[PDB]
Amino acid sequence: LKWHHHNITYWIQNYSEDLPRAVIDDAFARAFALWSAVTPLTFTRVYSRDADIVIQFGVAEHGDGYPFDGKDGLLAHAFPPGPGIQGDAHFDDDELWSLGKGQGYSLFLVAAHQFGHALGLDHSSVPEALMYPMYRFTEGPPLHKDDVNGIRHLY
Amino acid sequence: FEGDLKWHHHNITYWIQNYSEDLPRAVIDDAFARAFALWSAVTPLTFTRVYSRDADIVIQFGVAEHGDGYPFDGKDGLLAHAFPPGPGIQGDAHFDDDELWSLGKGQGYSLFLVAAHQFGHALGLDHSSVPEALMYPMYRFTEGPPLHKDDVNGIRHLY
Ligand SMILES: CNC(=O)[C@@H](NC(=O)[C@H](CC(C)C)CN(O)C=O)C(C)(C)C
Ligand SMILES: CNC(=O)[C@@H](NC(=O)[C@H](CC(C)C)CN(O)C=O)C(C)(C)C
Ligand SMILES: [Ca+2]
Ligand SMILES: [Ca+2]
Ligand SMILES: [Ca+2]
Ligand SMILES: [Ca+2]
Ligand SMILES: [Ca+2]
Ligand SMILES: [Ca+2]
Ligand SMILES: [Ca+2]
Ligand SMILES: [Ca+2]
Ligand SMILES: [Zn+2]
Ligand SMILES: [Zn+2]
Ligand SMILES: [Zn+2]
Ligand SMILES: [Zn+2]
């Protein structure tokens, strides 16, 4: 299951109260940049519901039939490629979002993982691969050779 | 802002007078605490957070002219400044809030790394000549351990 076009679009519907708009826009862009670096895909920011990947921050019940569970636990979730809600990525705003070393969760790293799913990737079994199902902070290049092979296999 | 005195006690106290609007107070408290930890790890010094003006190191975020006689210059340029050990304003650290404060890779400047540098001055350290050193006068983002051997030797020499 994957996208049939390579010029993918995204829409940042809203923001979190934890960080400045500029920091959030940048974090999402750098996250998309990791993937386009190893594939023929490109990512374009738009401002309408016509975008392939719609990004949203929410708490508890927020629309779909999948409410978040308050602080900690599930950090976020996304859907596989397709029309409508498919391909979208949502982030639990009951979590403390930040960047780098320190308390709170890295928005940059979590976004990179969520976008992996929105592109068609599944969970990895390599505990050190980005697509590994459990959160873990890391410095340096985020994508493990397992992630790179997985995306290249699809696109 | 380059004196020649050190602190005569090792139980240093600090007070976070106010905050920046760019990050949650919890993220800021944590960033400052981790910054001080860098230095207490390689010396016999300790740092205690207090809530009165009687603290040795008072931390403040300001815009343009903010009290002393050295106003900030708006976005970019001078990021922050601190004063050498001593009484009153001496030892304090000020951050320019016209800057976009953040953490890690990305746009904006790392509050963590800049604080580490300012606290170095607040402890008595001068500027280094080694490009890789934290006390180097130019801002540069880096991952991994912030303190260079030059910084470690410099602090141990005083304390
Ligand atoms: C601290 N919580 C977790 O690690 C949590 N896992 C998640 O929230 C996953 C995303 C992280 C790896 C970025 C959920 N996910 O698979 C999203 O697509 C659990 C407590 C292990 C469930
Ligand atoms: C981006 N701006 C700079 O690198 C700026 N340097 C500073 O503001 C120094 C602090 C940085 C290294 C955290 C000022 N300082 O030495 C304070 O004690 C210059 C453009 C190089 C002046
Ligand atoms: Ca949660
Ligand atoms: Ca969609
Ligand atoms: Ca939040
Ligand atoms: Ca952090
Ligand atoms: Ca400035
Ligand atoms: Ca003082
Ligand atoms: Ca600011
Ligand atoms: Ca950053
Ligand atoms: Zn959802
Ligand atoms: Zn996942
Ligand atoms: Zn000042
Ligand atoms: Zn300096």
Angle B111-122/B25-40 helices, nearest 10 degrees? 50
Chain A: closest CA distance from residue B8 (Å): 31
> What's the CA gap between A57 and A95, in Å, rounded?
10
CA of B140 to the centre of ligand 2 (A): 9
Task: Give the tokens for residue A121.
Answer: 């990737």
Superfamily for the B1-159 domain: Collagenase (Catalytic Domain) (3.40.390.10)
> What's the CA gap between A62 and B80, in Å, rounded?
41
Rg (CA), chain A: 15
Of B45, B126, B60, B117, the residue nearest B93 (C-alpha): B60
State the method. X-ray
Query: Per CB distance under 8 Å, which residues of A are interface residues toward B?
Result: 18-20, 22-23, 26-27, 30, 96, 98-104, 106, 108, 139-140
> What's the CA gap between B142 and A11, in Å, rounded?
31
One-letter identity of residue A55:
I
> What's the CA gap between B47 and B11, in Å, rounded?
6
> What's the CA gap between A19 and A67, in Å, rounded?
23
Of A131, A70, A112, A93, the residue nearest A13 (C-alpha): A93
Number of H helices and E strands in chain B, helices first, is 3, 7
Residues B25, B29, B32, B35: what is their CA dihedral angle, to the nearest 10 degrees? -120
| Residue in A23, A28, A34 to test binding to B, most B beta-carbons within 10 Å | A23
Question: What is A1-155's CATH number?
Answer: 3.40.390.10
CB-closest option in B23, B30, B106 to A108: B106
> What's the CA gap between B79 and B70, in Å, rounded?
12
Could you tell me the CA-to-CA distances from B75 to B19, B117, B147, B156 in Å, in that order? Answer: 17, 19, 27, 35
CA of A77 to the centre of ligand 12 (A): 7
Q: Where are the beta strands (DSSP E) in chain A?
A: 7-12, 42-45, 53-58, 76-78, 89-92, 97-98, 105-106
Q: Which sign, positive or negative, has the C-alpha torsion B65, B71, B76, B80?
A: negative
Other residues' Cβ atoms within 10 Å of the Cβ of residue B114: 20
CA of A103 to the centre of ligand 2 (A): 26
Task: Give the tokens for residue A126.
Answer: 């390599």
Upper half-sphere CA count for residue A5 (Cβ side, 13 Å)? 10
**With contact defined as beta carbons under 8 Å apart, do A16 and A91 qualify?**
yes
Angle at B12 between CA B11 and CA B14, to 5 degrees: 145
DSSP string of A117-154, one letter each residue:
HHTT----S-TTSTTSSS-----S----HHHHHHHHHH
Resolution in A: 2.1
Other residues' Cβ atoms within 10 Å of the Cβ of residue A47: 10
